[PDB]
Amino acid sequence: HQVLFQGFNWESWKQSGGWYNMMMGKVDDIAAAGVTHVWLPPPSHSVSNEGYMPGRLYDIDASKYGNAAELKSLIGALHGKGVQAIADIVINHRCADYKDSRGIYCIFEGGTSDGRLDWGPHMICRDDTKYSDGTANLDTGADFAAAPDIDHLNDRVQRELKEWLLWLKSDLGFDAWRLDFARGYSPEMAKVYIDGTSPSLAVAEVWDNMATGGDGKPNYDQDAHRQNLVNWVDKVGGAASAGMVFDFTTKGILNAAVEGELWRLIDPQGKAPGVMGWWPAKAVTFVDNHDTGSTQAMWPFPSDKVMQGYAYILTHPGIPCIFYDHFFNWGFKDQIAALVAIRKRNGITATSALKILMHEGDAYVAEIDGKVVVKIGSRYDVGAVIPAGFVTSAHGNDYAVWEK
Ligand SMILES: C=C1O[C@H](O[C@H]2[C@H](O)[C@@H](O)[C@@H](O[C@H]3[C@H](O)[C@@H](O)[C@H](O)O[C@@H]3CO)O[C@@H]2CO)[C@H](O)[C@@H](O)[C@@H]1N[C@H]1C=C(C=O)C(=O)[C@H](O)[C@H]1O
Ligand SMILES: C=C1O[C@H](O[C@H]2[C@H](O)[C@@H](O)[C@H](O)O[C@@H]2CO)[C@H](O)[C@@H](O)[C@@H]1N[C@H]1C=C(C=O)C(=O)[C@H](O)[C@H]1O
Ligand SMILES: C=C1O[C@H](O[C@H]2[C@H](O)[C@@H](O)[C@H](O)O[C@@H]2CO)[C@H](O)[C@@H](O)[C@@H]1N[C@H]1C=C(C=O)C(=O)[C@H](O)[C@H]1O
Ligand SMILES: [Ca+2]
Ligand SMILES: [Ca+2]
Ligand SMILES: [Ca+2]
């Protein structure tokens, strides 16, 4: 059994009294709903308030989310309930605290008394000319424009980041990683850190453009999109690796599908169309996250159909990830908990078998492991499609779930 939970949103750093402190009061509801892993925000000092422009990595006390003692208390509470803690690891880029003689911010400070992470421009990809001194290796991946990109090919960098990562586990108690902007460095570099730190899981955020047509909607065929993600997993180590990816293919397709285009939820081979359909064990599915949803709203799930999104990911193969706001602030807490209970009670896992029974514009009906049937869509009556022996156990706006 495995169900992830994003424990924050874009506005979290603003929480009165501290985000982690408030989260102590949410622990029991999260665990009781069947969540196994909670993804927490970048915990270090950041030039930006949300944490994605990290500087002094060991300086946890400078985080807008709360200090090291407050974070420890939270993870301890999650552990007290059998819930693991995932840390958002932002290492593609980093901000240096001080300017060098060129007037460039490239003198880094790790946050400890000695020199760990006290890097200089030699650790910045030479092709990131805005900050480098031209001496480093070329970036192994994409560049993050607003900050110095790190040369993960550098010996000291790999050594010190790995040391920092092991510390996040030993000192704070973190169990796993969420690899931010994994497009920024090669899967080979991600393998160093994953293999080198033994996280329970390491979910990579590789987010690439999804092909669309003249009308702005994603093409029905998204194989190129999931192939890219599958390729990342293969390169990082495949089945043996703790590495996996967020299923952005499923997110993009589902976004469109629920607007009466449920025929999009099956590929020509009869499989789910997202990463879920090719490598379910490595597909972390979701309805929205802090970028796509929340206040950034980069690619929000149709607001009036969010529960169809959960009825879908919570009953299907792949590892579902619930978003904080959807659980506590949209009034779906009991419905979402009920869906997780059905998943768990039926032994459904990331590798369960999926048999799609109907895939028409306004009606998607699928059967999982021959034990659960789920339906989403504006079409009310799908009774004729329901196999004998099944009876409703959960239902809501345009969705219903059956059990034997
Ligand atoms: C059991 C059904 O559950 C789901 O239907 C929702 C529906 O989408 C909502 O819009 C809402 O409809 C209610 C209206 O709000 C109300 O004004 C009206 O008077 O009554 C309707 C019906 O309650 O609520 C329902 C219930 O949550 C789901 O989308 C739908 O497909 C599903 N029906 C299926 C299950 C059965 C066994 O209980 C069969 O009887 C049906 O044939 C089967 O399609
Ligand atoms: C905020 C995200 O931006 C990028 O994703 C873009 C995709 O590449 C593009 O295909 C799509 O059309 O638009 C996306 C949104 O701009 C990055 O690839 C992605 O990693 C990034 N999300 C994380 C990175 C940050 C910088 O550290 C943060 O601002 C985000 O909050 C992260 O979740
Ligand atoms: C399970 C496999 O998933 C991916 O393969 C997909 C291909 O990339 C895609 O082009 C093809 O059409 O569909 C495939 C999915 O059916 C990975 O590339 C592939 O490596 C992976 N197979 C590995 C995983 C295992 C456990 O799931 C092992 O038993 C296999 O031997 C691995 O090769
Ligand atoms: Ca130092
Ligand atoms: Ca950069
Ligand atoms: Ca990079």
Q: What are the domain boundaries of the chain?
A: 2-347, 348-404
Closest Cα to atom 14, ligand 2: which residue?
A: 207
Resolution of the PDB structure in angstroms: 2.0
Residue found by looking up tokens 């789920």 in the block: 374
Q: Report the SS3 class of residue 363.
A: strand
Strand pairing partners for 5?
38, 322
Maximum distance among all Cα pairs of the chain, rounded to whole angstroms: 76
Q: How far is CA 373 from CA 2, 199, 366, in A?
A: 19, 34, 6
Judging by beta carbons within 10 Å of its beta carbon (0-12, 13-18, 19+), is residue 123 exposed, middle or buried?
buried
135 lines ligand 1 (CB under 6 A): no
d(CA 276, CA 283): 5
Q: How remote is the C-alpha of 222 from its chain's centroid?
A: 20
What DSSP state is assigned to residue 27? H
Pocket of ligand 2 (CB under 6 A): 52, 90, 144, 180-181, 183, 205, 207-209, 290-291, 298
302 lines ligand 1 (CB under 6 A): no
d(CA 217, CA 63): 39
Q: Comparing C-alpha atoms, which of 335, 317, 404, 246 is closest to residue 2?
A: 317
d(CA 35, CA 246): 17
Per DSSP, the residues of 260-285 read: T-GGGGS-TTSS-SSHHHH-GGGEEE
Judging by beta carbons within 10 Å of its beta carbon (0-12, 13-18, 19+), is residue 21 exposed, middle or buried?
middle
CATH topology of domain 348-404: Immunoglobulin-like (2.60.40)
326 lines ligand 1 (CB under 6 A): no
- φ, ψ of residue 284 to 5 degrees: the values are -100, 105
Annotated binding-site residue numbers for Ca(2+): 92, 109, 112, 114, 118, 128, 139, 142-144, 147, 149, 184
Q: Half-sphere exposure of residue 128, counting CA atoms within 13 Å on the CB side?
A: 30
Spatial contact of 75 and 111, defined as CB atoms under 8 Å apart:
no
For the chain, how big is the Rg over CA atoms in Å? 22
Q: How many CB atoms lie within 10 A of CB 64?
A: 17
Domains 2-347 and 348-404 share a fold: no
Distance in Å, CA 364 to ligand 3 centroid = 26
Q: How far is CA 23 from CA 7, 178, 192, 316, in A?
A: 8, 19, 32, 28
Spatial contact of 273 and 266, defined as CB atoms under 8 Å apart:
yes
d(CA 291, CA 52): 12
Judging by beta carbons within 10 Å of its beta carbon (0-12, 13-18, 19+), is residue 228 exposed, middle or buried?
middle
Find the angle CA(146)-CA(248)-CA(210) to the nearest 5 degrees.
Answer: 80
Quick one: how many helices (H) and strands (E) in the chain? Answer: 11, 15
Residue found by looking up tokens 């789910």 in the block: 272
Q: Confirm whether 205 is a catalytic residue.
A: yes
Residue of 88, 205, 288, 325 with catalytic role: 205
User: What was the structure determination method?
Assistant: X-ray
Closest Cα to atom 28, ligand 2: which residue?
A: 52
SS3 track for 152-180:
CCCHHHHHHHHHHHHHHHHHHCCCEEEEC
Distance in Å, CA 125 to ligand 5 centroid = 8
Q: Which amino acid is at 263?
A: W
- φ, ψ of residue 80 to 5 degrees: the values are -60, -20
d(CA 387, CA 102): 72
Annotated binding-site residue numbers: 45-47, 52-53, 92, 109, 112, 114, 118, 128, 139, 142-144, 147, 149, 178-184, 207, 209, 227, 234, 271, 277-279, 290, 296, 375, 380-382, 392-398, 402
Strand pairing partners for 358?
365
Spatial contact of 29 and 332, defined as CB atoms under 8 Å apart:
no
**106: which residues sit within 8 A by CB, 6+ positions away?**
96, 99, 100, 120, 121, 124, 131, 132, 133, 148
Find the angle CA(381)-CA(386)-CA(389) to the nearest 5 degrees.
Answer: 130
Spatial contact of 148 and 93, defined as CB atoms under 8 Å apart:
yes
Check the CA dihedral 35-201-177-140 and report its sign: negative
Spatial contact of 399 and 375, defined as CB atoms under 8 Å apart:
yes
Distance in Å, CA 48 to ligand 5 centroid = 15
What DSSP state is assigned to residue 220? S
Q: Comparing C-alpha atoms, which of 337, 335, 319, 349 is closest to residue 4?
A: 319
d(CA 300, CA 310): 14
Q: Which amino acid is at 27?
A: V
Residue found by looking up tokens 């400070």 in the block: 109
Which atom of ligand 3 approaches the CA of 271 most closely?
A: 16
Tell which phi-psi region holds residue 156, choosing left (phi > 0), alpha (psi between -120 and 50) or beta.
Answer: alpha
Best residue for ligand 1 mutational test, from 395, 398, 401 (most atoms within 8 Å of Cβ) = 395
d(CA 273, CA 321): 18
d(CA 359, CA 9): 33
Closest Cα to atom 19, ligand 3: which residue?
A: 234
What DSSP state is assigned to residue 397? T
Find the angle CA(273)-CA(279)-CA(282) to the nearest 5 degrees.
Answer: 115
Q: Comparing C-alpha atoms, which of 237, 248, 257 is closest to residue 356?
A: 257
Spatial contact of 281 and 210, defined as CB atoms under 8 Å apart:
no
Adjacency order of strands within the sheet including 391-396:
354-360, 363-368, 372-376, 399-403, 391-396
Q: How many CB atoms lie within 10 A of CB 84?
A: 21
Long-range contacts of residues 377-381, Cβ cutoff 8 Å, at least 24 apart: 377/260, 377/262, 377/308, 378/260
Residues measured by CB to lie within 5 Å of ligand 6, the ion: 92, 139, 141, 149, 184
d(CA 316, CA 52): 31
Q: How far is CA 9 from CA 41, 132, 167, 245, 330, in A?
A: 9, 33, 25, 20, 13
**392: which residues sit within 8 A by CB, 6+ positions away?**
400, 401, 402
Strand pairing partners for 85?
38
Alpha-helical runs (H) found in 281-332: 306-315, 324-328
Tell me which CATH code domain 2-347 carries. Answer: 3.20.20.80
Q: How far is CA 70 from CA 25, 63, 177, 320, in A?
A: 13, 11, 19, 27
Judging by beta carbons within 10 Å of its beta carbon (0-12, 13-18, 19+), is residue 364 exposed, middle or buried?
buried
Find the angle CA(41)-CA(46)-CA(52) to the nearest 5 degrees.
Answer: 50
Spatial contact of 93 and 149, defined as CB atoms under 8 Å apart:
yes
**388: which residues sit within 8 A by CB, 6+ positions away?**
none
Find the angle CA(189)-CA(192)-CA(198) to the nearest 5 degrees.
Answer: 135
Q: Confirm whether 180 is a catalytic residue.
A: yes
d(CA 101, CA 9): 38
